[PDB]
Structure formats: structure tokens, C-alpha cells
């Protein structure tokens with residue numbers, strides 16, 4: 001009687017191939033699931049294109065997308081909880097900065113490095 | 124003053140101009156912008172275009188759920204229930220986009236500064 005509904009994931013947006021933070025809201029059939037993204041958008045995503053990352057693991061190559069940093073590549077070096085929110089410490093140049101969960105995304109090539117271990121397809 | 128005017132204004136992290144409204148004159152040549160995507164910040168007059176609408180024949184960029192930064196040319200405008208749509212020609216087709224879905228790259232927006240830039 002298990003369901004993926006309410007699991008926090010990082011799921012592919014079809015138009016650009018980047019993986020964004022969201023939650024599963026329904027098993028919709030055809031191995032697709034309804035995704036509510038943190039940025040407020042909803043669509044159906046294939047199980048194979050959903051990463052069960054919560055959080056994205058340490059040492060992972062990621063991309064920062066915040067108000068001040070537009071698609072800046074970096075490496076996850078830390079996780080922090082603050083008032084029920086997850087933050088990532090992302091090392092770029094030789095400097096570490098904190099980013100909210102919503103602000104960390106994966107390029108297609110970055111997400112493919114996690115798919116074998118974290119991808120929902122096999123499950 | 125320029126308060127309440129619909130504009131196209133530069134987002135500093137990527138150089139793209141996005142649709143919004145001037146909500147306050149903040150002095151030192153800066154304006155508070157409410158962007159149609161719900162973000163607010165302060166923007167210099169030099170980075171604000173008084174386009175409403177963006178003129179016919181302008182090269183623009185479409186950004187929708189299905190089309191991720193796809194360049195084309197404005198060939199039409201229309202009103203549907205009080206909302207503006209742009210007709211963008213690209214790859215042999217014209218399609219209608221809501222105002223919020225039409226943005227300008229720095230190069231596309233730079234071209235419009237002399238005629239439309241709040242400036243100075």
C-alpha cells in the first residue's frame with residue numbers, strides 16, 4: 001500500500017532538460033507522475049526523469065539559479081536545515097555560498113550522473 | 124512621474140528584459156519594478172523600456188512552458204478579454220504569446236534604448 005505521493009524530488013522540465021525541485025502529487029499512469037514544482041508549475045513527468053534526491057548528495061555537480069546567480073555551475077559541499085528549510089552550500093571558484101532548495105537545479109548532464117542511483121524508473 | 128506604466132526592464136543577473144510595471148520612483152534614477160512573474164526589485168532608468176506594446180517588427184525571445192528562449196519577430200498584437208498577446212513569426216509560423224511570455228535579450232533590448240529607454 002505504498003505511494004510516491006508527497007515525496008520531494010528533482011524532476012526534469014521537458015523544454016530545457018534541467019531538473020528542478022518539486023513534489024509528486026499523483027501516480028497518473030504510463031509510468032508518469034504529476035509534479036508540483038517549488039516554482040509553482042505543475043505537469044506530468046516520466047518516472048525515469050524523476051530523481052529521488054532529498055537532499056542532493058554531497059560532492060554532486062549542480063547549477064545555482066537564484067535572483068542574483070543565473071545558471072552558475074558549482075559543487076554541493078554542505079547541507080543545512082534552518083526553520084524547516086533545506087539549504088545547500090555550493091562551492092564555485094574557491095568560495096562557498098548558501099542556496100535555498102528551490103535555487104539548486106541540475107543540467108541534463110548533471111542529472112544523468114544521479115539517474116542510476118536515484119532515478120524512479122527502476123522502482 | 125512614470126508610476127503605473129507597463130514597461131520592459133532588464134534583470135541584472137542575465138541581461139534579459141522582462142514585462143512589468145513601475146510601482147515607485149526611488150530616486151538616484153532608480154525605479155521599483157513589479158515584474159509580471161511576481162518578482163520585485165529596483166532598476167535604473169537606463170535599463171527600462173517604455174514599450175507597451177513592444178513595436179511591430181522587433182526581434183524578441185519567446186519563453187513559455189514548451190519553448191525555452193526561442194527568438195523570432197513581432198508581426199502582430201491583439202487584445203483578448205483585456206490581455207495583450209504578441210504574434211511572433213519564427214521557423215515559417217506565427218503563434219500568439221501572452222505579454223509575460225515575450226522577453227528581450229540584452230542585444231534585443233539595447234537596440235530599443237534610443238527610442239524607448241526611460242534613461243537618461
Ligand SMILES: CN1CCN(S(=O)(=O)c2ccc(C(N)=O)cc2)CC1
Nearest residue numbers: 039066067070134136141158160162
Ligand atoms: C523578472 N524575472 C526574471 C527572471 N528571474 S530569475 O530569478 O532569473 C528566475 C526565477 C525563476 C525561474 C524559474 N521559475 O525557473 C527562472 C528564473 C526572476 C525575475
Ligand SMILES: CN1CCN(S(=O)(=O)c2ccc(C(N)=O)cc2)CC1
Nearest residue numbers: 013015020037039041160187188191
Ligand atoms: C519547474 N519550472 C522550470 C522552468 N519553467 S519555464 O517555463 O521554463 C520558466 C518559467 C518562468 C520563468 C521566469 N519567471 O523567468 C523562467 C522559466 C517553469 C517550470
